[PDB]
Amino acid sequence: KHKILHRLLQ
Amino acid sequence: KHKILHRLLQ
Amino acid sequence: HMLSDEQMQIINSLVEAHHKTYDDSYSDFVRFRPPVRRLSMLPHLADLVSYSIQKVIGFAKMIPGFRDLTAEDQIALLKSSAIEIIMLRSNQSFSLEDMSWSCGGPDFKYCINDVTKAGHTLELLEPLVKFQVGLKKLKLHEEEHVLLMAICLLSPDRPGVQDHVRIEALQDRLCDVLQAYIRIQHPGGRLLYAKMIQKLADLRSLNEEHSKQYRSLSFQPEHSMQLTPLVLEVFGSEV
Amino acid sequence: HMLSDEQMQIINSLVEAHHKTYDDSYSDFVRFRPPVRRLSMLPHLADLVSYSIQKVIGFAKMIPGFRDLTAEDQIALLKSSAIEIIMLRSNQSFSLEDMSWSCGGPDFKYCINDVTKAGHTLELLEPLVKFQVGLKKLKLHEEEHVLLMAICLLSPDRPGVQDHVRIEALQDRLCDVLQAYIRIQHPGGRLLYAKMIQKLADLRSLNEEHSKQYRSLSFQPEHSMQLTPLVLEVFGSEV
Ligand SMILES: C=C1/C(=C\C=C2/CCC[C@]3(C)[C@@H](C(CCCC(C)(C)O)CCCC(C)(C)O)CC[C@@H]23)C[C@@H](O)C[C@@H]1O
Ligand SMILES: C=C1/C(=C\C=C2/CCC[C@]3(C)[C@@H](C(CCCC(C)(C)O)CCCC(C)(C)O)CC[C@@H]23)C[C@@H](O)C[C@@H]1O
C-alpha cells in the first residue's frame, strides 16, 4: 500500500 | 495478525 | 464478616502486579519523544500511551485466570479495554488540585489543552476530566483501584471475545472480592461498589468516543505516521 | 569549456533543495527519542533514520524530472535507494578527525559502537566507516555532493522500477552535469568522476548488507516495535 510514502510525495 | 501483542503476551 | 484466602491471594497478586507496572515517579517519561506545546503533542502522547499499553499488558498477564485464556481472547480483551485501563490507571497521576495529570515538572504535566494538540476536540476531553474527577473522589484504597482495573479488563462484553462465559466467570469472582473487600475493610463504603461499577459504564462511553477520534486520526497518514507500531496495532482494526 | 543554462539550472535546484532539507546544526535531533548507551540506541536511531527518510523525500521531490514519474516508480526508487542516500548525506556530519558522525555534544555524536546497540554487528559497520572515510576524502564541492545524491536516487537498476528507460535518461543527464561540472570547476578532478561513480557501487554493497540486517531485526516484533511507521514502510517489503 505505502500509505505514508504516497502522502509524503504529496 | 497482531505480531507485537502476541510477543508481549509471551 | 471476613475474606477467604483465595480472594486475599488475588488481592496480593493484583496489588503487587500493579506496583510492578506503575512508577509513581514517572522516570521513564524522558525516554519518550519530548512534548511540544498541527498536533505537536502527538509524538509525545503516542509514546506515553504506547508505554502504558505495554504496562497494561504486564498487569493483565499477572491477573489470575487471564493467562489461561486463549491468545485470541486475551488479545481481544486487551484491544477493546486498553484505552479504558489507561484512563483508570491514569487517575493516580491526576490531581483535582489543578485538574490535570502531573507526572513531572512543566514538561510532564498534562493539561486538558495538551491532549488537544494531539488530535482531540475540547468537547470530548470534557467528559474525561469529569470521569477523572469523579473517580478520584471515590478515594479508593489501592486494593479497590487495582481490582477495578482487573474487572474492567475482564468485561465479557467486548467485540472479538469468544469464551465469553469463562471471562464472565473470572470477572464475577473479581467482582465478589471487590464487594467483599469494600465491606470488611472500607468504612462508609455502603454505596461505593455501585459507584465503582457505574465508573465502568462511563469508561465505555469514553472508550467509544476515543474510537471515533482515533479512527479519523489514523486514516490520515501524516498523523498515523506519528503513532507507534504497538498503538497502531492495539487500536487498529486489522482484527 | 563551460556549462549550459539547463545544466546550471539543475545545479541551482539540487543545491537549493539540499540546503532546504539538511540542517548543519542538527537542531531537530532533540525531538527524537533520546539515545541510550538489548539495542538501547534503536529507539533513537529509528527516529534519526525516519527523520532523514522524510528529508530524502523532500530532496527527491525537488529533483528535476523525478516528480513527473509515476508514484510507483518514485516510491520504487525511494524504497530501494533510501538507505543509500542516508549514507551519502550523512557524510557532511562525518568526521575523519574522530571517525564518527558529530551532530551535537556527547549525546548526538554517533560512534561506531552506538550503531551496535541498534542491531548491527561490528563486522558490517566496518565497511560503512571505510565508505564514509573514502567519500569524505574526495572533498566534494557541495555541487558534486548534491549531484551524486540525485544520480544515486535515479539508478534505473532498482527492484520495483517500471519505466527504467526514463529513469535511465534522467540519471544520464545528471551524470553529464556532474562530469561537465567537475571539468569546468573542479581542479585536479581528472579522475574524480570515476571515483564518484565507484562510490555508488559501494553503496550497493552497504545497501544489501543493511537489508539482511534490517530483515532480521524486523522479523522480531520486540524490536520492530521500536521502529517508526515510515521506516517499517520504506524498508518493509509489503511491495
Ligand atoms: C497514560 C498515563 C497518564 C495519563 C493519561 C492521560 C493524559 C494525556 C492524554 C490521555 C493518554 C487520554 C487520551 C488518549 C490519547 C491517545 C491518542 C493515540 C492520541 O488517541 C484520550 C482519549 C479519550 C477522549 C474520550 C477524551 O477522546 C487517556 C488518558 C490521558 C500518566 C500516568 O498516570 C500513567 C498512565 O498510564
Ligand atoms: C541519518 C543521518 C546522520 C548519520 C548517519 C548514520 C549514524 C548512525 C547509524 C546510520 C543511520 C547507518 C545505519 C542504518 C541504521 C538503521 C536501522 C533501522 C537500525 O537498521 C546502517 C546500516 C548500514 C550497515 C551496512 C553498516 O549495516 C546509515 C547512516 C548512519 C546524521 C546527519 O548527517 C543526517 C543524516 O541523514
Q: Are C119 and C44 in contact (CB under 8 A)?
A: no
Instruction: Specify whether the CB–CB gap between D232 and C229 falls below 8 A.
Output: yes
Contact of C231 with C49, CB cutoff 8 Å: yes
CB within 8 Å of chain A, chain D residues 105-134: none
C-alpha cell at D142: 557541495
C222 Cβ under 8 Å from any chain A Cβ: yes
Of the residues C30, C31, C227, the best mutation for testing chain D's interface (the one with the most D CB atoms within 10 Å of its CB) is C31
Ligand nearest to the CA of D102: 2
Within 13 Å, how many C-alpha atoms sit on residue C201's CB side?
6
Q: Give the end-to-end CA distance of chain A in Å, rounded to a whole number.
A: 15
Note whether D202 and D84 are within 8 A (CB).
no
- D203, amino acid identity: L
Longest dimension (CA), chain A: 15
SS3 D102: strand
CA of C83 relative to ligand 1 center, distance in Å: 8
The C-alpha atoms of residue D45 and residue D227 are separated, in whole angstroms, by 9
Domain ranges of chain C: 1-239
Contact C234 CB / ligand 1 (< 6 Å):
no
Chains D and C touch (3+ CB pairs under 8 A): yes
- Name the resolution in angstroms: 3.0
Q: Which residue of C has its CA nearest to D36?
A: C31
Within 6 A (CB) of ligand 2 lie: D 45-46, 48-49, 52, 86-87, 89-90, 92-93, 101, 103, 110, 115, 118-120, 124-125, 128, 206, 209-210, 213-214, 231
CB contact under 8 A, C225 and D230: yes
C68 close contact with B: CB closer than 8 A: no
Which residue's CA is the closest to the ligand 2 atom numbered 19?
D118
The CB-side HSE value for D211 (13 A sphere, CA atoms) comes to 13
Give the Cα separation of D63 and D77 in Å (integer): 12
Question: Following CA atoms C66, C71, C73, C79 in sequence, which dihedral angle do they give, to the nearest 10 degrees?
Answer: 100
**d(Cα D32, Cα D234) in Å, to the nearest integer?**
19
Which technique was the structure solved with, according to the deposited record? X-ray
Helices (H), C22-107: 42-61, 71-90
Domain D1-239 bears CATH identifier 3.10.180.10: no
C59, C92 contact by CB (below 8 A): no
Task: Compute the distance from residue C233 Cα to the ligand 1 centre, in Å.
Answer: 17
Q: Are D55 and D88 in contact (CB under 8 A)?
A: no
User: Would you say C82 and C230 are in contact if contact means Cβ atoms under 8 Å apart?
Assistant: no
- For residues C58 and C52, what is the distance between their CA atoms, to the nearest angstrom? 10
**Neighbour count for residue C232 (Cβ, 10 Å):** 19
Identity of the amino acid at D206: L
User: D66, D69, D75, D231: which to substitute to probe chain A, counting the most A Cβ within 10 Å?
Assistant: D75
Q: How far is CA C191 from the centre of its chain?
A: 23
Q: Rounded to a whole number, what is the distance in Å from the CA of A8 to chain D's nearest CA?
A: 7
**Can you tell me which atom of ligand 1 is nearest the CA of C207?**
25
Taking CB atoms and an 8 Å limit, are D78 and A6 in contact across chains? no
* Residue C136 contacts residue C102 (beta carbons within 8 Å): no
Strand residues in chain C grouped as ranges (E):
101-102, 109-110
Among D87, D107, D217, D227, the mutation site with the greatest number of ligand 2 atoms within 8 A of its Cβ is D87
Tell me, what DSSP letter sits at residue C215? H
Chain B residues with beta carbon closer than 8 angstroms to that of C78: 5, 9
- How far CA C161 is from CA of C81, D17, D126, in Å, comes to 11, 52, 50
Q: Rounded distance, CA C223 to CA C42, Å?
A: 8
DSSP D107-118: TTEE-TTTTGGG
User: What residues of chain B lie within 8 A of the CB of D225, using their CB?
Assistant: 4, 7
CB contact at 8 A, D85 and D149: yes
Give the Å distances, CA to CA, from C217 to C59, C120, C166, C209, C221: 28, 9, 35, 13, 8
Distance between CA atoms of C34 and C43, rounded to whole angstroms?
A: 8
Classified as helix, coil or strand, C101 is: strand
